[PDB]
Amino acid sequence: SMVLAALVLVLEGEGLPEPLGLRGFFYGLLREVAENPFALGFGGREGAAWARVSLLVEGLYARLAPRLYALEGEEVRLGPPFRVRAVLQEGHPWAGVSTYPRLFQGPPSRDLALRFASPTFFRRKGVHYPVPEPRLVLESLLRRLEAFGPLKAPEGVREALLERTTVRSLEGRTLPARTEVDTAGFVGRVVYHLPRATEEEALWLSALGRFAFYSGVGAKTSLGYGRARAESA
Secondary structure, three states, rough: OOEEEEEEEEEOOOOOHHHHHHHHHHHHHHHOOOOOOOOEEEEEEOOOEEEEEEEEEEHHHHHHHHHOOOOOOEEEEEOOOEEEEEEOOOOOOOOOOOOOOOOOOOOOOOEEEEEEEEEOOEEEEEEEOOOOOOHHHHHHHHHHHHOOOOOOOOOHHHHHHHHEEEEEEEEEEEEEEEOOOEEEEEEEEEEEEEOOOOOHHHHHHHHHHHHHHOOOOOOHHHOOOOEEEEEEE
Protein backbone atom coordinates (compact mmCIF):
# COMPACT_ATOMS: atom_id res chain seq x y z
CA SER A 1 0.00 0.00 0.00
CA MET A 2 1.27 3.45 -0.72
CA VAL A 3 -0.80 5.45 1.76
CA LEU A 4 0.24 8.50 3.63
CA ALA A 5 -1.95 10.35 6.06
CA ALA A 6 -2.31 13.29 8.42
CA LEU A 7 -4.86 12.78 11.13
CA VAL A 8 -6.09 15.71 13.19
CA LEU A 9 -7.05 15.44 16.87
CA VAL A 10 -9.65 18.07 17.67
CA LEU A 11 -9.04 18.98 21.30
CA GLU A 12 -11.15 20.32 24.12
CA GLY A 13 -9.35 21.79 27.09
CA GLU A 14 -7.42 24.87 28.13
CA GLY A 15 -4.32 25.98 26.25
CA LEU A 16 -2.46 24.51 23.31
CA PRO A 17 -0.52 21.32 22.93
CA GLU A 18 3.17 21.53 23.75
CA PRO A 19 5.80 20.09 21.36
CA LEU A 20 7.46 17.73 23.83
CA GLY A 21 4.17 16.58 25.38
CA LEU A 22 2.77 15.84 21.91
CA ARG A 23 5.88 13.93 20.86
CA GLY A 24 5.97 12.06 24.19
CA PHE A 25 2.38 11.01 23.68
CA PHE A 26 3.09 9.86 20.15
CA TYR A 27 6.19 7.92 21.26
CA GLY A 28 4.07 6.34 23.98
CA LEU A 29 1.74 5.02 21.29
CA LEU A 30 4.78 4.03 19.18
CA ARG A 31 6.72 2.12 21.89
CA GLU A 32 3.56 0.08 22.23
CA VAL A 33 2.19 -0.56 18.74
CA ALA A 34 5.32 -0.04 16.60
CA GLU A 35 14.49 8.84 9.00
CA ASN A 36 11.30 9.35 11.03
CA PRO A 37 8.35 8.00 8.98
CA PHE A 38 6.11 10.53 10.66
CA ALA A 39 5.73 14.15 11.67
CA LEU A 40 3.75 15.96 14.31
CA GLY A 41 2.02 19.28 14.50
CA PHE A 42 -0.42 21.43 16.33
CA GLY A 43 -2.29 24.64 16.00
CA GLY A 44 -5.43 26.64 16.41
CA ARG A 45 -6.25 28.94 19.29
CA GLU A 46 -7.34 28.84 22.91
CA GLY A 47 -10.62 26.94 22.93
CA ALA A 48 -10.16 25.54 19.42
CA ALA A 49 -6.82 23.76 19.57
CA TRP A 50 -5.78 20.73 17.62
CA ALA A 51 -2.91 18.34 17.15
CA ARG A 52 -1.90 16.36 14.11
CA VAL A 53 -0.08 13.12 13.41
CA SER A 54 1.42 12.45 9.99
CA LEU A 55 2.15 8.90 9.03
CA LEU A 56 4.36 8.47 5.99
CA VAL A 57 4.40 4.69 5.53
CA GLU A 58 1.48 2.23 5.31
CA GLY A 59 2.44 -0.15 8.07
CA LEU A 60 2.63 2.67 10.56
CA TYR A 61 -0.69 4.03 9.30
CA ALA A 62 -2.28 0.57 9.61
CA ARG A 63 -1.04 0.18 13.14
CA LEU A 64 -1.54 3.69 14.48
CA ALA A 65 -4.73 4.96 12.84
CA PRO A 66 -7.03 2.55 14.71
CA ARG A 67 -5.25 3.40 17.94
CA LEU A 68 -5.65 7.12 17.23
CA TYR A 69 -9.35 6.64 16.46
CA ALA A 70 -9.83 4.90 19.82
CA LEU A 71 -8.75 8.16 21.51
CA GLU A 72 -12.14 9.74 20.75
CA GLY A 73 -13.82 10.63 24.03
CA GLU A 74 -10.60 10.10 26.00
CA GLU A 75 -8.34 12.42 27.96
CA VAL A 76 -4.69 12.67 26.88
CA ARG A 77 -1.78 14.76 28.08
CA LEU A 78 -0.12 16.79 25.34
CA GLY A 79 1.52 19.01 27.87
CA PRO A 80 -1.76 20.16 29.31
CA PRO A 81 -4.57 17.57 29.45
CA PHE A 82 -7.13 17.59 26.62
CA ARG A 83 -10.13 15.54 25.77
CA VAL A 84 -10.05 14.27 22.19
CA ARG A 85 -13.36 15.27 20.64
CA ALA A 86 -12.72 13.89 17.19
CA VAL A 87 -10.04 12.23 15.13
CA LEU A 88 -10.28 13.48 11.55
CA GLN A 89 -8.80 12.28 8.25
CA GLU A 90 -10.88 14.82 6.30
CA GLY A 91 -12.98 17.85 7.12
CA HIS A 92 -10.16 19.84 8.69
CA PRO A 93 -7.67 21.98 6.74
CA TRP A 94 -4.72 20.00 8.11
CA ALA A 95 -6.25 16.51 7.82
CA GLY A 96 -5.87 14.29 4.78
CA VAL A 97 -5.17 10.83 3.45
CA SER A 98 -3.62 10.11 0.07
CA THR A 99 -1.22 7.83 -1.77
CA TYR A 100 2.27 8.34 -3.12
CA PRO A 101 1.17 8.04 -6.74
CA ARG A 102 -1.31 10.84 -6.09
CA LEU A 103 1.51 13.11 -4.98
CA PHE A 104 2.56 13.04 -8.61
CA GLN A 105 -0.85 13.97 -10.05
CA GLY A 106 0.29 17.44 -11.08
CA PRO A 107 -0.28 19.44 -13.10
CA PRO A 108 3.41 20.11 -13.51
CA SER A 109 4.29 23.66 -12.76
CA ARG A 110 7.50 25.68 -12.66
CA ASP A 111 6.11 27.50 -9.62
CA LEU A 112 5.61 26.23 -6.08
CA ALA A 113 4.05 28.44 -3.43
CA LEU A 114 4.63 27.14 0.07
CA ARG A 115 3.15 28.41 3.27
CA PHE A 116 5.26 27.80 6.34
CA ALA A 117 2.70 27.56 9.10
CA SER A 118 5.01 26.85 12.02
CA PRO A 119 8.62 27.90 12.53
CA THR A 120 10.82 26.23 9.92
CA PHE A 121 14.58 25.73 10.15
CA PHE A 122 17.49 23.57 8.99
CA ARG A 123 20.59 22.14 10.58
CA ARG A 124 23.81 23.52 9.14
CA LYS A 125 27.20 23.05 10.73
CA GLY A 126 25.85 22.34 14.20
CA VAL A 127 23.67 25.42 14.13
CA HIS A 128 20.05 25.90 13.18
CA TYR A 129 19.43 28.17 10.17
CA PRO A 130 16.02 29.73 9.57
CA VAL A 131 16.18 30.91 5.93
CA PRO A 132 13.94 28.92 3.55
CA GLU A 133 16.46 28.65 0.72
CA PRO A 134 15.27 26.57 -2.25
CA ARG A 135 18.07 24.00 -1.87
CA LEU A 136 17.31 23.50 1.84
CA VAL A 137 13.51 23.28 1.54
CA LEU A 138 13.53 21.11 -1.56
CA GLU A 139 16.33 18.80 -0.38
CA SER A 140 14.42 18.27 2.88
CA LEU A 141 11.29 17.30 0.99
CA LEU A 142 13.09 15.20 -1.64
CA ARG A 143 15.15 13.27 0.91
CA ARG A 144 12.05 12.20 2.81
CA LEU A 145 9.97 11.56 -0.30
CA GLU A 146 12.77 9.30 -1.52
CA ALA A 147 13.02 7.60 1.91
CA PHE A 148 9.35 6.77 2.20
CA GLY A 149 7.91 6.75 -1.31
CA PRO A 150 8.23 4.33 -4.21
CA LEU A 151 10.37 6.47 -6.51
CA LYS A 152 13.68 8.30 -6.55
CA ALA A 153 14.40 11.32 -8.70
CA PRO A 154 16.88 11.03 -11.55
CA GLU A 155 20.10 12.77 -10.54
CA GLY A 156 19.64 15.51 -13.15
CA VAL A 157 16.13 16.23 -11.80
CA ARG A 158 17.57 16.51 -8.29
CA GLU A 159 20.28 18.80 -9.63
CA ALA A 160 17.72 21.05 -11.30
CA LEU A 161 15.47 21.16 -8.24
CA LEU A 162 18.24 21.92 -5.76
CA GLU A 163 20.60 24.08 -7.82
CA ARG A 164 18.45 25.94 -10.34
CA THR A 165 15.26 26.70 -8.39
CA THR A 166 15.02 30.35 -7.42
CA VAL A 167 12.71 32.46 -5.31
CA ARG A 168 10.11 34.62 -7.01
CA SER A 169 8.67 36.08 -3.79
CA LEU A 170 9.03 35.83 -0.03
CA GLU A 171 7.10 37.29 2.85
CA GLY A 172 7.47 36.38 6.47
CA ARG A 173 9.44 36.48 9.67
CA THR A 174 11.30 34.29 12.09
CA LEU A 175 9.90 33.23 15.44
CA PRO A 176 11.69 31.56 18.34
CA ALA A 177 11.72 27.79 18.59
CA ARG A 178 11.18 27.64 22.31
CA THR A 179 12.23 23.98 22.75
CA GLU A 180 15.60 24.78 21.18
CA VAL A 181 18.73 26.70 22.04
CA ASP A 182 19.41 29.86 20.02
CA THR A 183 17.04 28.80 17.25
CA ALA A 184 14.41 30.65 15.28
CA GLY A 185 12.30 29.42 12.40
CA PHE A 186 10.66 31.05 9.40
CA VAL A 187 6.90 31.49 9.15
CA GLY A 188 5.28 32.96 6.06
CA ARG A 189 5.00 32.37 2.33
CA VAL A 190 7.63 31.71 -0.30
CA VAL A 191 7.09 31.21 -4.04
CA TYR A 192 9.76 29.03 -5.66
CA HIS A 193 10.31 28.99 -9.38
CA LEU A 194 12.32 26.58 -11.53
CA PRO A 195 13.45 28.23 -14.77
CA ARG A 196 13.14 26.13 -17.91
CA ALA A 197 11.84 23.13 -15.99
CA THR A 198 11.33 20.03 -18.08
CA GLU A 199 7.89 18.42 -17.68
CA GLU A 200 9.45 15.76 -15.43
CA GLU A 201 11.18 18.38 -13.27
CA ALA A 202 8.00 20.46 -12.94
CA LEU A 203 6.09 17.32 -11.96
CA TRP A 204 8.62 16.48 -9.26
CA LEU A 205 8.44 20.08 -8.00
CA SER A 206 4.67 19.74 -7.72
CA ALA A 207 5.06 16.41 -5.92
CA LEU A 208 7.44 17.89 -3.34
CA GLY A 209 4.78 20.52 -2.84
CA ARG A 210 2.02 17.97 -2.25
CA PHE A 211 4.27 15.87 0.03
CA ALA A 212 5.06 18.89 2.22
CA PHE A 213 1.52 18.77 3.69
CA TYR A 214 2.38 15.36 5.16
CA SER A 215 6.12 15.53 5.82
CA GLY A 216 6.66 19.12 6.81
CA VAL A 217 9.90 20.88 6.01
CA GLY A 218 13.33 20.91 7.63
CA ALA A 219 14.41 19.96 11.11
CA LYS A 220 12.50 18.80 14.18
CA THR A 221 9.24 18.09 12.39
CA SER A 222 8.68 15.59 15.24
CA LEU A 223 8.21 18.65 17.47
CA GLY A 224 5.74 20.50 15.28
CA TYR A 225 8.27 22.70 13.48
CA GLY A 226 8.21 22.97 9.72
CA ARG A 227 4.48 22.51 9.26
CA ALA A 228 3.85 23.57 5.69
CA ARG A 229 1.55 23.29 2.74
CA ALA A 230 1.41 24.20 -0.92
CA GLU A 231 -0.87 27.06 -2.00
CA SER A 232 -1.94 28.73 -5.22
CA ALA A 233 1.05 30.46 -6.83
